[PDB]
Amino acid sequence: NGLPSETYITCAEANEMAKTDSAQVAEIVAVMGNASVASRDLKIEQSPELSAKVVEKLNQVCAKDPQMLLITAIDDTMRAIGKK
């Protein structure tokens, strides 16, 4: 009944927000993103080059699939780049 913002919002729309609040979106994708990636690998460090791209490619995925909720989309991207 109480759907969290990041659960009800799509990464494509998160990109839209970035036009108004880039730091807000970059922070969110970094917070759970860094934790998420480190939860499956644990060797992944706080690399700014990873976040910068984890959102760049992410919004493109949502642009093709609007059903990619932000909360899931980040985890999904962590799955893709979670094996380097």
Curated annotation (Swiss-Prot):
Domain of life: Bacteria
Gene Ontology CC, one term: outer membrane-bounded periplasmic space
Coiled-coil region list: none
UniProt keyword annotations, A-Z: Signal
UniProt keyword Signal, yes or no: yes
Protein name in UniProt: Uncharacterized protein YmgD
Species name: Escherichia coli (strain K12)
Portion of the full sequence shown: 26 to 109 of 109
